[PDB]
From a paper:
Here we show that addition of cupric ions to a [name] 6-PGLac bearing a putative metal binding site leads to the emergence of peroxidase activity (kcat 7.8 × 10–2 s–1, KM 1.1 × 10–5 M). Gratifyingly, this screen revealed one hit: in the presence of [name], [name] bearing an [name] mutation (Cu·6-PGLac hereafter) catalyzes the oxidation of o-dianisidine (S5 and S6†). Simple metal salt addition thus suffices to endow a protein with novel catalytic activity, very different from the native activity.
Thus, 6-PGLac was co-crystallized with 3 mM [name] followed by soaking with 12 mM [name] (Cu·6-PGLac). The X-ray structure was refined to a resolution of 1.39 Å. The third copper (Cu1) is located in the putative metal binding site and displays a T-shaped [2 + 1] coordination geometry. The copper is bound to His67 and His104 (at a distance of 2.00 Å and 1.92 Å, respectively) and displays a weak contact with a water molecule (WATxx 2.80 Å), which is held in place via a hydrogen bond to the carbonyl oxygen of Val101 (O···O 2.81 Å). This structure also contains further unspecifically bound copper ions in the lactonase active site as well as on the surface. However, these binding sites are characterized by low occupancy, as reflected by the height of anomalous difference density peaks, and thus presumably have a far lower binding affinity for copper ions. The potentially coordinating oxygen of Asp131 identified by the in silico search and of the Tyr69 are located 6.55 Å and 4.25 Å from Cu1 respectively. Although the STAMPS algorithm suggested a possible facial triad coordination, a T-shaped Cu coordination was observed upon Cu(ii) supplementation.
Numbering used by the authors: 2 to 244
Write the structure that this text describes.
Amino acid sequence: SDTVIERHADTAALVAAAGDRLVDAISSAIGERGQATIVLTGGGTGIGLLKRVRERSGEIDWSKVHIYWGDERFVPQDDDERNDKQAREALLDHIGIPPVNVHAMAASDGEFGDDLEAAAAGYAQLLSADFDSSVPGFDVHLLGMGGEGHVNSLFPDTDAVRETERLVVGVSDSPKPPPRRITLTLPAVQNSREVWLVVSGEAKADAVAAAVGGADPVDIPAAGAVGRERTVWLVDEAAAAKL
Ligand SMILES: [Cl-]
Ligand SMILES: [Cl-]
Ligand SMILES: [Cu+2]
Ligand SMILES: [Cu+2]
Ligand SMILES: [Cu+2]
Ligand SMILES: [Cu+2]
Ligand SMILES: [Cu+2]
Ligand SMILES: [Cu+2]
Ligand SMILES: [Cu+2]
Ligand SMILES: [Cu+2]
Ligand SMILES: [Cu+2]
Ligand SMILES: [Cu+2]
Ligand SMILES: [Cu+2]
Ligand SMILES: [Cu+2]
Ligand SMILES: [Cu+2]
Ligand SMILES: [Cu+2]
Ligand SMILES: [Cu+]
């Protein structure tokens, strides 16, 4: 699998570039296969790039695009900490995507109640359904990365990042609030044609260098975030400073 690193000046430049790249990737996938399956992420740059996509959203036939999430905060549906809510405000509420093409992870006041394990297994069955229909399962899985290398809600040195069988798990004790999350696991992330890590800032530079260096994914979860066709690091100068 090829690896691409593309370094831009600063956060604003990075987010603009990443949004442009995503519009191009979605168009390319629709051209080749008649549809596109994309996995969204949260965090500042993950949501910021979606705002840029919104600027060019007329270039895409959204009836042909399917949306998943790599992780989600297991909190009430209307909570500001929700990744799906933030994505809807940034992009999804502004485009002609059919609601049934959008596959949000469950909320804690949703159909599974506050049962985290059931909610994770619910999304896993949905991915099994996607994975029964397409190979690889995803065209592009977007990711942010924390300073310690975490991606989705897979934190270093945890049973979640160690998971090799299940596609989705619950995390009940995230070291970063909120404590409860639903997350795709590395086997699910790795069933993407491309995995894109969008990373800004000095505090991320050590983890970028360790992940690109080919670290063990348990120690640096981002090192296991690898696409079947390519892995793309979209970074700014500050985050690239140890390459
Ligand atoms: Cl609000
Ligand atoms: Cl339980
Ligand atoms: Cu640039
Ligand atoms: Cu600037
Ligand atoms: Cu472009
Ligand atoms: Cu409420
Ligand atoms: Cu809140
Ligand atoms: Cu809040
Ligand atoms: Cu708002
Ligand atoms: Cu709008
Ligand atoms: Cu359901
Ligand atoms: Cu349970
Ligand atoms: Cu995270
Ligand atoms: Cu254990
Ligand atoms: Cu350092
Ligand atoms: Cu410079
Ligand atoms: Cu869908």
